[PDB]
């Protein structure tokens, strides 16, 4: 059980994995967890999904898997090495905390596997209206492998397949180990959302999760990468600006076919025929954050 | 310090890394070490060089290294994760032993890095006449990334660059941590060679290293992959059949330019103008092995 200064980490520890399709509020979610005094998530590691994908490709190739098994590099060996690699990155790339956490969006395509490597780990799958996520990719020019930012239809098709896989993984892991978290409900009702989430995680309530913007860059708080694309959004308090700014910007033929391009919308409970849906009524807390954000209380940082 | 059954392993343990350009006697070398009662090398892991190459490419890209540093995934973090990953594979893919060892040929392109990750590790760089190694690749159709098996000139050019890099790494690591082992001298004088090698390693002499063919497939002995391309050679005792069977098979224009294609030949002490060199006089031990091999005492295994 390797140490950090005095916190011990190991494959049996309670870990939190946060993920989902990029542009779904995954940075906001992990920032609110980072605010909790018992948790550290930190920035996207980038390398954890890369080594997962490679290791999965080794076993999917019949030829490579035979060579590896003949060499004694069995699944048992691959699994022990993946555990060791992932724990070191999670443990070392940020401050120590009692509960460690990782947010790399596409790790949730592998939640079944991760839940076997880490038997007391839990998963938060961020779910956001595919139309809002795709509009974010395209307008912010966020580069994602496989997503052609010149085509709403292609991005929505890829969004649909991505969340289809991650949602199935979530369902296979089961209600005790993976919780779908709806972005729109997180923004409309942050206190109610975090209360359910922390209860699902087995972690005591702390108000700090509702104050993540007080804790940017502070010891025990929210560490941000200046390069990550959500940084200038997450430094503000929870607000409504991004709930449905996609309405009106989707080509008419894609609106027409929305239910066929993205059947996962209705699977997940979204109204694929509304432009936009009424997602709910915001807490006064969030209404007040929103008007302050829109009127200019929060300045763009110089960096 | 993770355990195995009772042997403890960790980043400070004495490890042996064996490598060199493929087709240079690296399997024979590691088989003779596997014969020693204190050492286990085992089969090529395949994945250790793959993850090294990826991790090196992360830091060589200015853009990726900035993103990683901004995420807290520094060299210190990358290095701890590489140590953890590599130790698990080395430790788990074969039987436990007091001294662990790994043979993946191209790991010796990274011996400086490996010697920093593993401060009591040592390196055996196998050196074989580039003409014999390239002739082996081509005639046995051994697939190596970058080596065009239709061109002796291209393979010799790639051989030359490969051994140039590994030899420089060996020299930078220094005489106390890396030993060039000449294939031809290993075959001509196996006892004298292994006595020097084991002294360089700080390991007591054991006759077992001269009996590796008695120990194929046995507990505490030499484990082989049925798929690896040297398996049907290494099951025989040390012999002379492969010393210079390349003579006469190299195109005349390549013989003409040998010193310019492969200046590393003369750097390493080989005669690039002789077809072939007289590499030395064999021990009677090896002369007797050779005639038994050539007359058919050792049958091709049914598998
Ligand atoms: N404080 C905050 N309140 C509400 N949404 C926020 C937020 N900080 C970030 N988000 C939203 O999180 C989305 C990014 O999710 P991710 O981190 O998974 O890429 C961005 O949506 P938009 O690009 O549409 O504005 C951003 O607006
Ligand atoms: N018992 C043995 N005696 C001598 N050479 C041996 C040997 N077992 C294997 N080798 C040689 O080791 C070379 C392979 O090196 P590597 O394991 O690094 O790919 C092969 O050369 P050839 O293909 O020319 O016959 C093989 O002959
Ligand atoms: Mn915290
Ligand atoms: Mn506050
Ligand atoms: Mn940072
Ligand atoms: Mn042994
Ligand atoms: Mn014997
Ligand atoms: Mn085997």
XYZ file of C-alpha atoms and ligand atoms in Angstrom:
666
model
C 0.000 0.000 0.000
C 2.005 2.958 -1.285
C 2.022 6.070 0.849
C 1.642 9.793 0.236
C 2.118 12.762 2.556
C -0.211 10.286 5.526
C -2.555 8.663 2.987
C -2.295 5.074 1.760
C -3.478 4.064 -1.704
C -4.060 0.657 -3.257
C -6.283 -1.267 -5.618
C -8.934 -1.732 -2.893
C -9.355 1.962 -2.114
C -12.609 3.795 -2.891
C -11.952 5.631 -6.145
C -14.302 7.875 -8.069
C -14.207 7.791 -11.864
C -16.038 10.639 -13.609
C -16.638 10.615 -17.327
C -19.046 10.923 -20.205
C -18.920 12.392 -23.710
C -16.770 15.553 -23.689
C -18.673 18.822 -23.329
C -21.181 17.278 -20.911
C -20.252 19.043 -17.672
C -17.580 16.548 -16.622
C -15.175 19.315 -15.574
C -17.862 21.057 -13.502
C -18.759 17.757 -11.823
C -15.183 16.917 -10.882
C -14.574 20.510 -9.755
C -17.501 20.223 -7.343
C -16.029 16.982 -5.990
C -12.563 18.550 -5.709
C -14.188 21.207 -3.523
C -15.098 18.512 -0.976
C -12.438 18.274 1.780
C -12.187 14.470 1.444
C -11.738 14.231 -2.352
C -9.175 15.192 -4.967
C -9.865 14.648 -8.671
C -7.623 17.105 -10.479
C -6.994 17.640 -14.146
C -7.522 15.157 -16.974
C -4.502 12.828 -17.024
C -4.844 12.154 -20.780
C -2.615 9.076 -20.548
C -4.997 6.824 -18.612
C -7.472 6.497 -21.510
C -4.550 6.087 -23.932
C -3.100 3.106 -22.074
C -6.565 1.596 -21.539
C -7.274 1.737 -25.265
C -3.938 0.133 -26.108
C -4.324 -2.657 -23.547
C -7.848 -3.372 -24.798
C -6.584 -3.549 -28.387
C -3.936 -6.111 -27.371
C -6.552 -8.611 -26.200
C -8.980 -7.884 -29.066
C -6.381 -9.010 -31.644
C -6.403 -12.798 -31.765
C -2.831 -12.853 -33.052
C -1.427 -10.492 -30.420
C -3.304 -12.178 -27.576
C -1.809 -15.562 -28.524
C 1.728 -14.147 -28.543
C 1.118 -12.475 -25.168
C -0.383 -15.581 -23.575
C 2.538 -17.650 -24.928
C 4.841 -15.128 -23.216
C 3.087 -15.374 -19.855
C 1.595 -11.892 -20.290
C -1.931 -13.104 -19.490
C -4.987 -11.030 -18.593
C -3.983 -11.487 -14.955
C -0.614 -9.916 -15.754
C -2.035 -7.182 -17.975
C -4.599 -6.377 -15.259
C -2.004 -6.110 -12.486
C 0.112 -3.792 -14.636
C -2.892 -1.610 -15.531
C -3.853 -1.319 -11.844
C -0.298 -0.330 -10.946
C 0.021 2.189 -13.782
C -3.355 3.839 -13.202
C -2.975 4.099 -9.422
C 0.395 5.821 -9.765
C -0.978 8.431 -12.163
C -4.130 9.068 -10.103
C -2.143 9.188 -6.866
C 0.786 11.295 -7.998
C -0.518 13.877 -10.456
C -2.303 15.908 -7.782
C -2.523 16.568 -4.059
C -3.129 13.590 -1.763
C -6.597 13.139 -0.297
C -8.521 10.450 1.530
C -10.626 9.739 -1.577
C -8.941 9.845 -4.972
C -10.860 10.571 -8.152
C -10.138 10.740 -11.883
C -11.936 12.543 -14.704
C -10.933 11.498 -18.224
C -14.187 11.592 -20.231
C -13.879 8.385 -22.244
C -12.721 6.172 -19.379
C -16.421 5.491 -18.829
C -16.418 3.388 -21.988
C -14.453 0.953 -19.775
C -16.330 1.163 -16.488
C -17.010 -2.577 -16.336
C -13.287 -3.264 -16.684
C -12.333 -0.482 -14.261
C -14.833 -1.765 -11.694
C -13.107 -5.160 -11.791
C -9.628 -3.654 -11.439
C -10.816 -1.429 -8.580
C -13.541 -3.278 -6.679
C -14.566 -0.442 -4.352
C -14.557 2.191 -7.084
C -17.673 4.058 -8.195
C -18.575 5.856 -11.409
C -20.357 9.114 -12.226
C -21.535 9.159 -15.837
C -22.311 12.737 -16.886
C -25.271 12.978 -19.243
C -26.039 16.122 -21.200
C -28.413 16.720 -24.096
C -26.490 15.522 -27.128
C -27.564 18.656 -28.997
C -25.886 20.867 -26.395
C -22.698 18.784 -26.351
C -22.376 18.706 -30.140
C -23.113 22.420 -30.451
C -20.337 22.977 -27.900
C -17.817 20.864 -29.825
C -18.583 22.615 -33.095
C -18.789 26.236 -31.928
C -15.788 25.971 -29.583
C -13.835 23.892 -32.136
C -13.085 21.149 -29.632
C -11.020 18.429 -31.326
C -12.286 14.923 -30.561
C -11.103 11.845 -32.430
C -13.872 10.719 -34.760
C -16.024 13.870 -34.495
C -16.190 15.807 -37.785
C -16.888 19.370 -36.567
C -18.204 20.348 -40.011
C -21.297 18.112 -39.626
C -23.905 18.282 -36.839
C -25.308 15.012 -38.183
C -21.950 13.248 -37.902
C -21.228 14.641 -34.450
C -24.701 13.704 -33.217
C -24.242 10.229 -34.695
C -20.903 9.832 -32.900
C -22.323 11.355 -29.715
C -25.160 8.825 -29.844
C -22.832 5.832 -30.216
C -20.460 7.103 -27.533
C -23.161 7.599 -24.896
C -24.866 4.354 -25.950
C -21.702 2.419 -25.022
C -21.005 4.312 -21.804
C -24.622 4.025 -20.670
C -24.624 0.271 -21.299
C -21.400 -0.036 -19.289
C -23.036 1.989 -16.524
C -26.055 -0.319 -16.527
C -23.885 -3.440 -16.484
C -21.900 -2.123 -13.509
C -25.202 -1.582 -11.721
C -27.013 0.980 -9.571
C -24.685 0.479 -6.608
C -21.519 1.332 -8.586
C -22.480 3.770 -11.380
C -24.783 6.803 -11.237
C -25.932 8.733 -14.324
C -25.724 12.439 -13.450
C -27.784 14.747 -15.658
C -25.964 17.988 -16.453
C -29.185 20.005 -16.751
C -30.403 18.837 -13.341
C -26.980 19.551 -11.855
C -27.227 23.161 -13.034
C -30.902 23.683 -12.169
C -30.650 22.027 -8.727
C -27.004 21.793 -7.659
C -27.714 21.223 -3.944
C -30.250 18.456 -4.544
C -27.969 16.860 -7.136
C -24.833 16.872 -4.966
C -26.794 15.551 -1.981
C -27.883 12.517 -4.002
C -24.408 12.114 -5.530
C -22.548 12.230 -2.215
C -25.065 9.770 -0.747
C -24.481 7.426 -3.686
C -20.745 7.757 -3.039
C -20.935 7.050 0.693
C -19.304 10.404 1.485
C -20.520 12.840 4.147
C -22.180 16.068 3.048
C -20.000 19.159 2.813
C -21.259 22.581 1.742
C -17.921 23.113 -0.007
C -19.287 21.351 -3.113
C -21.574 24.351 -3.604
C -18.619 26.784 -3.408
C -16.199 25.404 -6.002
C -15.542 28.872 -7.439
C -14.103 29.994 -4.072
C -11.549 27.191 -4.279
C -9.883 27.537 -7.702
C -6.153 27.042 -7.303
C -6.216 26.599 -3.553
C -4.636 23.839 -1.446
C -7.243 21.146 -0.981
C -9.367 22.760 -3.677
C -9.867 22.793 -7.445
C -6.739 22.458 -9.579
C -7.155 23.512 -13.216
C -5.090 23.211 -16.377
C -4.788 26.495 -18.249
C -4.969 24.480 -21.481
C -8.175 22.493 -20.875
C -11.172 23.827 -22.827
C -13.621 24.039 -19.881
C -11.349 26.045 -17.574
C -12.853 29.454 -18.308
C -16.359 28.114 -17.765
C -15.663 26.202 -14.536
C -14.132 29.207 -12.747
C -17.612 30.661 -12.544
C -20.323 29.521 -10.128
C -22.984 27.122 -11.355
C -25.127 29.015 -13.851
C -27.663 28.601 -16.682
C -25.922 30.255 -19.637
C -25.117 26.923 -21.348
C -28.398 25.057 -20.816
C -29.840 25.480 -24.316
C -27.849 27.942 -26.377
C -27.890 25.349 -29.196
C -31.530 26.083 -30.083
C -31.764 27.562 -33.564
C -28.222 26.642 -34.639
C -28.892 23.068 -35.760
C -29.571 22.580 -39.501
C -33.218 21.967 -40.318
C -32.640 18.501 -41.767
C -30.907 17.432 -38.540
C -33.750 18.793 -36.393
C -36.094 16.802 -38.622
C -34.176 13.543 -38.158
C -33.127 14.157 -34.530
C -34.890 11.087 -33.140
C -33.323 8.818 -35.789
C -29.818 10.300 -35.626
C -29.752 10.241 -31.827
C -32.205 7.694 -30.409
C -30.221 7.886 -27.169
C -31.798 11.288 -26.504
C -35.186 9.699 -25.759
C -33.579 6.651 -24.126
C -31.980 9.021 -21.628
C -35.211 10.972 -21.071
C -34.584 13.999 -23.310
C -37.294 15.431 -25.594
C -35.770 15.121 -29.093
C -38.712 16.985 -30.660
C -38.533 20.184 -28.563
C -36.397 23.190 -29.551
C -35.431 23.398 -26.760
C -36.985 21.294 -23.996
C -38.035 22.959 -20.791
C -35.423 21.263 -18.638
C -36.879 22.493 -15.337
C -37.077 25.411 -12.911
C -33.800 26.706 -11.458
C -33.092 27.200 -7.792
C -32.963 30.916 -6.871
C -29.285 30.279 -6.053
C -28.556 29.536 -9.721
C -30.759 32.382 -11.009
C -28.653 34.801 -8.957
C -25.366 33.288 -10.177
C -26.562 33.554 -13.764
C -27.430 37.258 -13.759
C -24.117 38.094 -12.073
C -22.239 36.072 -14.703
C -24.118 37.639 -17.622
C -23.702 41.193 -16.329
C -19.921 40.854 -15.933
C -19.061 40.204 -12.268
C -16.570 37.481 -13.276
C -13.695 38.748 -15.437
C -11.847 36.705 -18.030
C -8.539 35.784 -16.323
C -5.382 37.368 -17.714
C -3.691 33.979 -18.178
C 7.691 -3.889 -1.822
C 5.272 -6.267 -3.528
C 5.656 -9.941 -2.761
C 5.672 -13.155 -4.775
C 5.672 -16.788 -3.669
C 8.823 -15.460 -0.722
C 10.496 -12.901 -3.008
C 10.107 -9.131 -2.717
C 10.388 -6.861 -5.748
C 10.714 -3.097 -6.036
C 12.334 -0.330 -8.021
C 15.628 -0.763 -6.116
C 16.050 -4.459 -6.887
C 18.887 -5.711 -9.108
C 17.306 -6.254 -12.513
C 18.950 -7.513 -15.671
C 17.865 -6.047 -19.001
C 19.027 -7.958 -22.085
C 18.629 -6.541 -25.551
C 20.177 -5.648 -28.865
C 19.059 -5.733 -32.499
C 16.832 -8.786 -33.076
C 18.594 -11.857 -34.454
C 21.725 -11.183 -32.389
C 21.591 -14.058 -29.903
C 19.419 -12.263 -27.347
C 17.236 -15.339 -26.796
C 20.281 -17.581 -26.292
C 21.755 -15.087 -23.819
C 18.599 -14.834 -21.731
C 18.126 -18.616 -21.884
C 21.594 -19.085 -20.396
C 20.696 -16.647 -17.612
C 17.350 -18.383 -17.026
C 19.356 -21.571 -16.477
C 21.039 -19.955 -13.454
C 19.212 -20.882 -10.209
C 19.076 -17.238 -9.047
C 17.658 -15.645 -12.228
C 14.452 -15.708 -14.241
C 14.171 -13.809 -17.529
C 11.412 -15.541 -19.454
C 9.814 -14.724 -22.757
C 9.706 -11.354 -24.508
C 6.902 -9.326 -22.904
C 6.280 -7.304 -26.098
C 4.349 -4.644 -24.176
C 7.268 -3.141 -22.248
C 8.908 -1.648 -25.364
C 5.477 -0.527 -26.607
C 4.720 1.486 -23.474
C 8.276 2.869 -23.353
C 7.973 4.141 -26.915
C 4.619 5.770 -26.203
C 5.806 7.442 -22.995
C 8.909 8.744 -24.775
C 6.757 10.162 -27.580
C 4.603 12.033 -25.038
C 7.559 14.059 -23.763
C 9.108 14.560 -27.225
C 5.984 16.419 -28.429
C 6.167 19.983 -27.152
C 2.390 20.324 -27.342
C 1.608 17.094 -25.491
C 4.249 17.711 -22.828
C 2.733 21.127 -22.039
C -0.753 19.638 -21.645
C 0.637 16.878 -19.408
C 2.660 19.255 -17.241
C -0.404 21.525 -16.921
C -2.302 18.436 -15.714
C 0.284 17.521 -13.086
C 1.429 14.522 -15.144
C 5.099 15.534 -14.911
C 8.173 13.434 -15.675
C 8.185 12.472 -11.998
C 4.649 11.134 -12.403
C 5.295 9.482 -15.760
C 8.439 7.870 -14.307
C 6.653 6.471 -11.248
C 3.932 5.000 -13.461
C 6.479 3.455 -15.850
C 8.359 1.880 -12.919
C 5.119 0.450 -11.547
C 3.938 -0.865 -14.918
C 7.260 -2.438 -15.893
C 7.873 -4.086 -12.516
C 4.448 -5.732 -12.569
C 5.008 -7.206 -16.027
C 8.554 -8.393 -15.250
C 7.484 -9.794 -11.884
C 4.258 -11.485 -12.898
C 4.736 -12.914 -16.382
C 7.055 -15.691 -15.210
C 8.212 -17.660 -12.188
C 9.551 -15.705 -9.206
C 13.300 -15.647 -8.643
C 15.771 -13.723 -6.532
C 17.019 -11.815 -9.596
C 14.498 -10.753 -12.221
C 15.474 -10.162 -15.830
C 13.790 -8.986 -19.032
C 14.690 -9.534 -22.683
C 12.851 -7.323 -25.177
C 15.454 -6.508 -27.857
C 14.792 -2.806 -28.396
C 14.542 -1.861 -24.722
C 18.286 -1.242 -24.954
C 17.560 1.871 -27.000
C 16.373 3.220 -23.616
C 19.034 1.914 -21.253
C 19.920 5.368 -19.923
C 16.277 5.944 -19.003
C 15.852 2.422 -17.611
C 19.000 2.798 -15.506
C 17.485 5.899 -13.894
C 14.149 4.194 -13.218
C 15.932 1.139 -11.796
C 19.151 2.297 -10.137
C 20.605 -1.138 -9.371
C 19.744 -2.582 -12.772
C 22.360 -3.750 -15.268
C 22.292 -4.194 -19.033
C 23.629 -6.830 -21.426
C 23.813 -5.486 -24.974
C 24.102 -8.385 -27.428
C 26.323 -7.593 -30.397
C 26.389 -9.755 -33.499
C 27.885 -9.127 -36.926
C 25.295 -6.999 -38.687
C 25.680 -9.169 -41.787
C 24.634 -12.264 -39.836
C 21.680 -10.507 -38.194
C 20.378 -9.060 -41.462
C 20.818 -12.359 -43.297
C 18.784 -13.954 -40.495
C 15.958 -11.413 -40.775
C 15.748 -11.800 -44.537
C 16.068 -15.581 -44.879
C 13.807 -16.349 -41.900
C 11.360 -13.580 -42.902
C 11.436 -11.990 -39.464
C 9.139 -8.947 -39.435
C 10.739 -5.907 -37.798
C 9.265 -2.422 -38.025
C 11.378 -0.380 -40.418
C 13.360 -3.294 -41.904
C 12.557 -3.878 -45.595
C 13.368 -7.598 -45.999
C 13.681 -7.175 -49.776
C 16.877 -5.083 -49.426
C 20.113 -6.131 -47.686
C 21.279 -2.528 -48.054
C 18.207 -1.164 -46.273
C 18.347 -3.762 -43.515
C 22.065 -3.167 -42.983
C 21.412 0.580 -42.906
C 18.686 0.119 -40.281
C 20.814 -2.392 -38.371
C 23.642 0.150 -38.303
C 21.454 2.948 -36.925
C 19.809 0.662 -34.374
C 23.079 -0.629 -32.913
C 24.610 2.859 -33.110
C 21.903 4.154 -30.740
C 21.981 1.180 -28.381
C 25.779 1.214 -28.213
C 25.806 4.931 -27.398
C 23.244 4.315 -24.644
C 25.444 1.502 -23.350
C 28.470 3.801 -23.299
C 26.549 6.574 -21.545
C 25.351 4.157 -18.852
C 28.975 3.166 -18.322
C 31.154 0.090 -17.820
C 29.715 -0.650 -14.381
C 26.102 -0.878 -15.627
C 26.169 -2.068 -19.267
C 28.271 -4.821 -20.858
C 28.469 -5.421 -24.623
C 28.309 -9.195 -25.149
C 29.596 -10.423 -28.508
C 27.468 -13.235 -29.929
C 30.390 -14.834 -31.780
C 32.520 -14.940 -28.629
C 29.575 -16.322 -26.666
C 29.320 -19.230 -29.107
C 33.061 -19.845 -29.493
C 33.808 -19.583 -25.747
C 30.587 -19.943 -23.750
C 32.276 -20.741 -20.413
C 34.704 -17.822 -20.600
C 31.905 -15.505 -21.727
C 29.453 -16.472 -18.971
C 32.195 -16.240 -16.338
C 32.868 -12.625 -17.314
C 29.138 -11.867 -17.617
C 28.212 -13.286 -14.212
C 31.148 -11.412 -12.661
C 29.933 -8.186 -14.270
C 26.486 -8.921 -12.832
C 27.686 -9.624 -9.292
C 26.151 -13.113 -9.388
C 27.899 -16.292 -8.226
C 29.044 -18.801 -10.827
C 26.724 -21.697 -11.599
C 27.482 -24.419 -14.142
C 23.779 -24.440 -15.021
C 24.369 -21.595 -17.504
C 26.290 -24.085 -19.644
C 23.370 -26.567 -19.586
C 20.428 -24.456 -20.758
C 19.241 -27.183 -23.141
C 18.681 -29.534 -20.170
C 16.309 -26.985 -18.654
C 13.786 -26.135 -21.399
C 10.323 -26.012 -19.881
C 11.392 -26.974 -16.388
C 10.563 -25.263 -13.080
C 13.335 -22.801 -12.362
C 14.591 -23.202 -15.918
C 14.081 -21.824 -19.424
C 10.523 -20.889 -20.383
C 9.915 -20.512 -24.125
C 7.109 -19.177 -26.293
C 6.159 -21.556 -29.088
C 5.588 -18.489 -31.280
C 8.937 -16.702 -30.853
C 11.243 -17.072 -33.872
C 14.367 -18.225 -31.964
C 12.681 -21.051 -30.045
C 13.764 -23.872 -32.347
C 17.353 -22.648 -32.292
C 17.629 -22.092 -28.525
C 16.471 -25.618 -27.630
C 19.802 -26.866 -28.897
C 23.107 -26.555 -27.034
C 25.471 -23.741 -27.948
C 26.784 -24.474 -31.434
C 28.504 -22.921 -34.474
C 25.966 -23.462 -37.261
C 24.911 -19.780 -37.353
C 28.307 -18.075 -37.055
C 28.756 -17.110 -40.712
C 26.170 -18.742 -42.933
C 25.600 -15.296 -44.506
C 28.837 -15.467 -46.524
C 28.073 -15.551 -50.235
C 24.424 -14.483 -49.926
C 24.958 -10.718 -49.790
C 24.654 -8.857 -53.128
C 27.984 -7.802 -54.590
C 27.223 -4.080 -54.459
C 26.456 -4.359 -50.732
C 29.690 -6.267 -50.062
C 31.464 -3.480 -51.936
C 29.904 -0.721 -49.822
C 29.815 -2.676 -46.534
C 32.036 -0.245 -44.631
C 29.945 2.754 -45.750
C 26.535 1.139 -45.228
C 27.473 -0.204 -41.798
C 30.339 1.767 -40.243
C 29.269 0.298 -36.901
C 30.790 -3.025 -37.970
C 34.331 -1.651 -37.613
C 33.367 0.500 -34.614
C 32.362 -2.700 -32.836
C 35.522 -4.552 -33.904
C 34.176 -6.573 -36.848
C 36.113 -6.927 -40.123
C 33.741 -5.433 -42.731
C 36.069 -6.439 -45.587
C 36.285 -10.189 -44.842
C 33.814 -12.727 -46.267
C 33.606 -13.994 -43.599
C 35.937 -12.975 -40.769
C 37.706 -15.645 -38.795
C 35.841 -14.992 -35.565
C 38.049 -17.272 -33.453
C 38.728 -20.863 -32.412
C 35.887 -22.766 -30.730
C 36.143 -24.606 -27.454
C 36.071 -28.402 -27.962
C 32.775 -28.298 -26.032
C 31.146 -26.299 -28.840
C 32.786 -28.358 -31.613
C 31.172 -31.465 -30.117
C 27.762 -29.779 -29.786
C 27.958 -28.649 -33.399
C 28.607 -32.047 -34.981
C 25.815 -33.610 -32.914
C 23.417 -30.864 -34.025
C 24.382 -31.152 -37.698
C 24.139 -34.948 -37.739
C 20.617 -34.972 -36.268
C 20.785 -35.757 -32.534
C 18.258 -32.985 -31.779
C 14.856 -33.515 -33.417
C 12.498 -30.760 -34.495
C 9.806 -30.699 -31.765
C 6.318 -31.821 -32.758
C 4.740 -28.590 -31.484
N -20.021 26.797 -13.680
C -20.637 26.164 -14.675
N -21.992 26.170 -14.716
C -22.605 25.521 -15.708
N -22.064 24.866 -16.740
C -20.732 24.863 -16.660
C -19.956 25.469 -15.686
N -18.608 25.276 -15.936
C -18.601 24.568 -17.038
N -19.849 24.231 -17.498
C -20.170 23.621 -18.773
O -19.532 22.405 -18.892
C -19.515 22.123 -20.308
C -18.224 21.388 -20.607
O -18.341 20.042 -20.173
P -16.915 19.285 -20.212
O -16.112 19.796 -19.091
O -17.394 17.789 -19.955
O -16.169 19.434 -21.636
C -19.397 23.487 -20.995
O -20.614 23.700 -21.761
P -20.543 24.718 -23.044
O -19.271 24.520 -24.000
O -21.716 24.452 -23.885
O -20.584 26.242 -22.573
C -19.476 24.475 -19.833
O -20.360 25.548 -20.112
N 22.022 -22.737 -29.125
C 22.386 -21.752 -29.942
N 23.680 -21.675 -30.337
C 24.044 -20.676 -31.146
N 23.285 -19.716 -31.684
C 22.023 -19.811 -31.261
C 21.500 -20.770 -30.411
N 20.145 -20.568 -30.209
C 19.885 -19.507 -30.930
N 20.984 -18.962 -31.545
C 20.989 -17.911 -32.543
O 20.405 -16.769 -32.035
C 20.031 -15.989 -33.191
C 18.746 -15.263 -32.849
O 19.041 -14.165 -31.999
P 17.696 -13.521 -31.381
O 17.190 -14.448 -30.357
O 18.301 -12.201 -30.728
O 16.595 -13.175 -32.510
C 19.667 -17.010 -34.274
O 20.628 -16.864 -35.355
P 20.171 -17.343 -36.855
O 18.704 -16.872 -37.301
O 21.093 -16.727 -37.816
O 20.256 -18.929 -37.005
C 19.998 -18.350 -33.620
O 20.722 -19.199 -34.495
Mn -10.604 18.554 -2.093
Mn -18.682 30.606 -1.321
Mn -2.535 22.853 -13.288
Mn 16.413 -19.813 -13.286
Mn 23.785 -30.879 -19.143
Mn 5.478 -20.109 -22.733
